[PDB]
Amino acid sequence: NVFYRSSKPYPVAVRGEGVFLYDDAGRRYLDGSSGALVANIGHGRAEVGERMAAQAARLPFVHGSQFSSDVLEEYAGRLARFVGLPTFRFWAVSGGSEATESAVKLARQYHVERGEPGRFKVITRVPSRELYTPLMRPEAWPKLPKPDPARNGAEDAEGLRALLEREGPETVAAFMAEPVVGASDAALAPAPGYYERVRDICDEAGIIFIADEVMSGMGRCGSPLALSRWSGVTPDIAVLGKGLAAGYAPLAGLLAAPQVYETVMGGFMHGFTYAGHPVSVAAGLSVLDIVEREDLTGAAKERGAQLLAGLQALQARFPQMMQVRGTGLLLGVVLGDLIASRIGAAALKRGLITYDHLLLGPPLSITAAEVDGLLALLAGALEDVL
Amino acid sequence: NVFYRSSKPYPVAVRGEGVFLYDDAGRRYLDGSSGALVANIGHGRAEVGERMAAQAARLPFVHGSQFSSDVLEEYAGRLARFVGLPTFRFWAVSGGSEATESAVKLARQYHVERGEPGRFKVITRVPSRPEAWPKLPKPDPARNGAEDAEGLRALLEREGPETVAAFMAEPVVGASDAALAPAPGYYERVRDICDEAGIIFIADEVMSGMGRCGSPLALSRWSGVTPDIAVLGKGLAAGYAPLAGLLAAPQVYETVMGGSGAFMHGFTYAGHPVSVAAGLSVLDIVEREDLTGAAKERGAQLLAGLQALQARFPQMMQVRGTGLLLGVVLGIASRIGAAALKRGLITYDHLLLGPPLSITAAEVDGLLALLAGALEDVL
């Protein structure tokens, strides 16, 4: 009675242990992409399950329009401190899209509250009521060129000033970007100096800098927030998701600078039935305890380096691997002729889960031996197809 | 460090037990609207917690583009059977809006697969591009059910059925018009009109379903009528997990699968094992404690209580109720809600009421006593 996403055959999963998944045929798979870069701390954590059970028995649900909860109050502070934004305000939601839309809405409202309704444009980067209707206009979404990792970071970032100049800085509300790109361009990352310059340009222009960390955050890239890898730069709004509760509960949200929060509170949103959901928040808190206790951020750095080195080593045997990239445990492989689905299918056949581009990112808790196993499975898939 | 929704006070809740909530200040509140008609089986069900914990320890997450799960396969069948749509296909998502969005996209894709891309309009009903969303007048229970529904056919002829993909409606209206329900014969006529027009009938039971209105699905109260797509949420996991979804008739499912063979690619947590496990546990309880039957009994008691109050407060222009989904039309509601909260009663010119289906007879009387006090304060 399941409405499958497509007519293809869907294996039925029955168990998840660590970095592995098992189906109802006994087949075992190494979760090379943590599902969709979601299962950051691995599968089968009884610790998280116990925490969710305790919250369900104590206080499972309250609607945010009526009550806050002790677990949300606790988690908000814990999360803010972990990511290095101790004074920021946490807006909890159930998914990444809700979190992203909340961020955009907030950026727009911020300027309207300050008496600057002319600021409505939201700049985004390739390849990633009456007060809000301007966001519906095509002109509200100007595009910044794709970053060029081979160019001096600050110089590359200056492209933002150029765009602002032609758009008219007084018409711009914000600039939103994934510090390290996800699926759109597998693990593409700007050169050093890029975000430091972006932060400064945004401050000069008076626009809100939104960091989309839905995929790159929570230790994934070897740092609490990937943006911090660039001289500790901090955004005005950080968007979180997927890895927040690491697959244990539908949890996402954003962290807003005090200035932004206070502006909107003076003079935010209504729906979201499960926004701030106690059981889901408890899952996030338990996951955070683990991320910190096991120093998975540090683990992502070490294991990420090992996996990247392995992918680079494979290029000699498979020169069809046009480019290999990685920041922490968010890596990418660009393929070409001297398909990503063809190699993905072959990988699955061999028991390797993956996301012309291949996005890789196993659980931050993966062991060194398991990283080598992942590489061996990938080599087999490449051999089958190439 | 919490980003509150507004500058007003948001008491910090710390415990939920049965139909009661308690804050860190010691205060107790009677959850008269189950939050937002979400907590259908009451608060603090350790049973559900244990089921979620067991799932988290066994298989917490798989992405639907890669794997299905044994718990989802189990739940899909159990849910389908419980709601009276045993052969329907379950599409799981994490929230009501995702479910409704999915239903509309499915209805539109259905016609595209059949070579009728012109059918793009989705008819909805007041007050639940503009031209793509025709509006049917709100129901009039004072009018004959079939007579009232006939307006849908007239609207179809006005719009041109060849340009319509579906008709979506809440069997019993929610907050838009507190518990407004059509007269007998309404949906029976709707079903026939849709069949004749060849359009998809979508029943939005996100608030009205899962026993809320004294039936597995509220639509069934109208001669067992079944939709082509039933949208569910809220009461699904009853506040224990963000879970929602839709059940599609085999005809609809097979048409998409037999055509392009693909539906949707978004929704990271769609089919989420832990949330689905909560839904399965909630379903076990709903069936075991016959909460659908309870809603009918407790609902009749609460409605009678509201009608008695109406005799005292003529400002209560209308008092309505279907199972435990009730409404009070005033001729104001906001002030009553504020006065009620001060007295310890949680509420949703309309007042929507709907306590947990597990509420006891004594607790219904307690709810009525608190409401009476709030009414006296304002009226």
Side-chain angles (χ1 to χ4, degrees):
Chain A
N1 285 84
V2 173
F3 193 132
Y4 299 113
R5 291 179 181 260
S6 76
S7 66
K8 63 172 292 183
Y10 285 94
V12 179
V14 297
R15 173 181 299 283
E17 300 175 351
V19 303
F20 300 102
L21 291 176
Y22 304 78
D23 63 19
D24 68 0
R27 290 195 58 190
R28 194 185 69 164
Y29 307 83
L30 194 166
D31 203 347
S33 59
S34 307
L37 273 64
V38 171
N40 291 8
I41 70 173
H43 304 101
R45 312 292 297 225
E47 184 181 342
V48 181
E50 307 306 297
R51 294 287 284 285
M52 296 182 309
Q55 188 62 49
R58 176 66 170 175
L59 175 84
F61 183 88
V62 296
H63 189 281
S65 68
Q66 308 170 318
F67 300 96
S68 177
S69 66
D70 53 355
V71 296
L72 181 55
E73 294 295 332
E74 180 180 0
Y75 181 63
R78 281 287 302 289
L79 176 63
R81 290 189 286 284
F82 172 65
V83 304
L85 303 176
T87 66
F88 283 44
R89 294 280 182 156
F90 181 56
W91 170 246
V93 292
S94 302
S97 298
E98 296 185 318
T100 298
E101 295 304 302
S102 292
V104 171
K105 192 282 184 62
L106 180 56
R108 169 59 180 168
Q109 183 172 355
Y110 175 77
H111 294 123
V112 166
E113 295 295 340
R114 299 178 62 195
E116 286 176 23
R119 293 179 175 281
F120 72 97
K121 302 173 182 176
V122 179
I123 298 172
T124 55
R125 188 183 60 196
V126 176
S128 308
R129 284 180 174 175
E130 57 300 309
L131 299 178
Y132 298 90
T133 173
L135 280 44
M136 300 179 94
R137 298 205 293 276
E139 300 94 311
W141 305 85
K143 293 291 188 174
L144 181 71
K146 178 181 297 189
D148 187 348
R151 184 178 184 183
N152 171 280
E155 180 188 309
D156 194 40
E158 277 290 326
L160 178 56
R161 187 193 306 276
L163 177 54
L164 280 167
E165 302 176 314
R166 79 188 315 293
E167 287 298 320
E170 71 292 336
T171 67
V172 183
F175 168 59
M176 182 170 61
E178 297 172 279
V180 174
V181 180
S184 61
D185 206 320
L188 177 64
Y194 186 94
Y195 291 113
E196 290 87 346
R197 179 55 55 76
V198 166
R199 173 71 275 177
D200 291 342
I201 292 299
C202 286
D203 288 340
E204 290 184 6
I207 65 173
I208 295 294
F209 177 24
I210 304 170
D212 181 346
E213 299 255 9
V214 175
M215 184 178 306
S216 66
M218 302 311 99
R220 190 84 236 172
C221 293
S223 175
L225 289 175
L227 187 62
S228 298
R229 292 181 64 93
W230 278 262
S231 304
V233 166
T234 56
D236 297 308
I237 296 173
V239 189
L240 309 171
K242 290 192 176 188
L244 204 52
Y248 287 88
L251 182 70
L254 59 76
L255 284 168
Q259 163 77 296
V260 177
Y261 173 65
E262 296 171 44
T263 293
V264 57
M265 286 301 100
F268 179 55
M269 297 184 75
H270 306 63
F272 298 121
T273 299
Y274 278 98
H277 178 52
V279 187
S280 293
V281 172
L285 181 60
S286 179
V287 167
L288 181 58
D289 289 327
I290 295 172
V291 170
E292 300 184 310
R293 185 177 72 237
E294 303 187 346
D295 184 27
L296 295 185
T297 296
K301 298 178 65 61
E302 187 174 306
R303 298 283 71 75
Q306 174 189 12
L307 187 44
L308 173 57
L311 298 174
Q312 298 174 319
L314 284 172
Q315 297 190 83
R317 177 166 157 58
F318 301 104
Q320 293 89 339
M321 295 175 83
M322 305 278 251
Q323 179 168 49
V324 57
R325 305 179 298 216
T327 300
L329 276 172
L330 174 49
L331 306 93
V333 177
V334 179
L335 303 163
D337 87 88
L338 300 185
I339 177 177
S341 58
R342 295 166 183 173
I343 292 184
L348 187 62
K349 222 69 170 60
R350 281 170 177 276
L352 177 63
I353 304 298
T354 57
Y355 203 79
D356 41 50
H357 286 37
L358 180 58
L359 192 57
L360 297 169
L364 277 40
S365 47
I366 187 169
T367 66
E370 301 176 327
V371 167
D372 288 322
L374 181 164
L375 291 164
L377 298 175
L378 186 65
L382 290 171
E383 170 62 53
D384 303 321
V385 181
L386 305 172
Chain B
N1 288 79
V2 178
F3 193 125
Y4 294 107
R5 297 181 174 223
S6 76
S7 55
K8 71 181 176 186
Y10 290 98
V12 176
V14 301
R15 181 176 65 171
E17 192 170 63
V19 305
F20 298 105
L21 297 172
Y22 306 81
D23 64 31
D24 66 0
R27 280 213 64 183
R28 185 182 73 170
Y29 308 79
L30 194 165
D31 200 348
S33 57
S34 307
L37 269 71
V38 173
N40 288 19
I41 69 170
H43 305 95
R45 315 288 305 218
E47 184 180 337
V48 181
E50 285 308 305
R51 291 283 279 286
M52 295 180 312
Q55 190 60 51
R58 187 194 317 140
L59 177 83
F61 185 86
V62 294
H63 185 284
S65 68
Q66 308 173 317
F67 295 103
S68 179
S69 65
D70 58 351
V71 305
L72 175 61
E73 296 290 331
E74 176 176 9
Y75 182 59
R78 286 284 307 286
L79 179 64
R81 289 189 287 284
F82 171 70
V83 305
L85 304 174
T87 69
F88 282 45
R89 294 272 180 164
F90 182 57
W91 172 253
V93 297
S94 304
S97 291
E98 293 187 334
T100 295
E101 169 185 349
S102 292
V104 171
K105 291 192 178 179
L106 177 56
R108 280 171 172 167
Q109 195 178 324
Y110 174 78
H111 295 124
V112 172
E113 299 293 341
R114 302 179 60 183
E116 297 187 58
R119 287 172 177 277
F120 71 92
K121 303 178 188 174
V122 174
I123 298 169
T124 54
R125 185 181 62 196
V126 181
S128 299
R129 50 186 178 180
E131 322 98 296
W133 298 78
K135 299 286 188 181
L136 181 70
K138 68 175 178 176
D140 184 339
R143 190 177 176 185
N144 177 285
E147 158 185 44
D148 205 14
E150 250 313 84
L152 177 57
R153 189 180 310 187
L155 180 54
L156 280 166
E157 300 167 358
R158 179 74 67 176
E159 295 295 321
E162 74 281 354
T163 64
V164 182
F167 170 58
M168 191 178 290
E170 289 178 288
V172 172
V173 182
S176 303
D177 200 318
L180 176 59
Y186 189 96
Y187 293 112
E188 289 87 347
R189 177 58 61 77
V190 169
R191 180 66 276 181
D192 293 322
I193 278 46
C194 291
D195 290 337
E196 301 169 2
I199 65 173
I200 295 297
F201 177 22
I202 302 169
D204 181 347
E205 302 244 15
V206 169
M207 180 178 285
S208 67
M210 300 313 104
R212 188 82 241 175
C213 295
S215 291
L217 288 178
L219 183 58
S220 299
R221 295 175 63 75
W222 279 264
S223 305
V225 164
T226 56
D228 300 309
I229 296 175
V231 192
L232 309 169
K234 289 180 168 58
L236 215 52
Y240 286 89
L243 180 68
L246 63 76
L247 279 167
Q251 176 66 288
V252 179
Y253 175 69
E254 299 297 48
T255 290
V256 49
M257 292 298 118
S260 60
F263 180 44
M264 291 180 91
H265 303 302
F267 304 134
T268 301
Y269 278 91
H272 179 47
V274 185
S275 296
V276 168
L280 181 58
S281 182
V282 166
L283 180 58
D284 284 337
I285 294 164
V286 167
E287 298 183 316
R288 187 175 70 230
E289 301 182 357
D290 185 22
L291 298 185
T292 297
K296 287 194 295 186
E297 187 176 296
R298 297 284 68 76
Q301 180 193 357
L302 197 45
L303 177 59
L306 294 175
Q307 302 176 327
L309 288 174
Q310 187 183 210
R312 169 180 172 193
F313 298 109
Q315 293 80 177
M316 294 173 85
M317 291 179 62
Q318 304 181 65
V319 170
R320 303 180 295 220
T322 302
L324 275 180
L325 180 49
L326 308 89
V328 181
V329 180
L330 301 146
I332 172 60
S334 295
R335 282 175 289 196
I336 297 180
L341 183 57
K342 186 178 183 60
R343 284 174 178 279
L345 173 66
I346 303 299
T347 55
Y348 201 81
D349 54 60
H350 285 72
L351 196 61
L352 182 64
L353 302 173
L357 277 35
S358 49
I359 188 169
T360 68
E363 298 171 335
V364 169
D365 290 333
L367 186 165
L368 288 162
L370 295 173
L371 183 64
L375 291 170
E376 180 65 14
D377 297 327
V378 184
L379 308 172

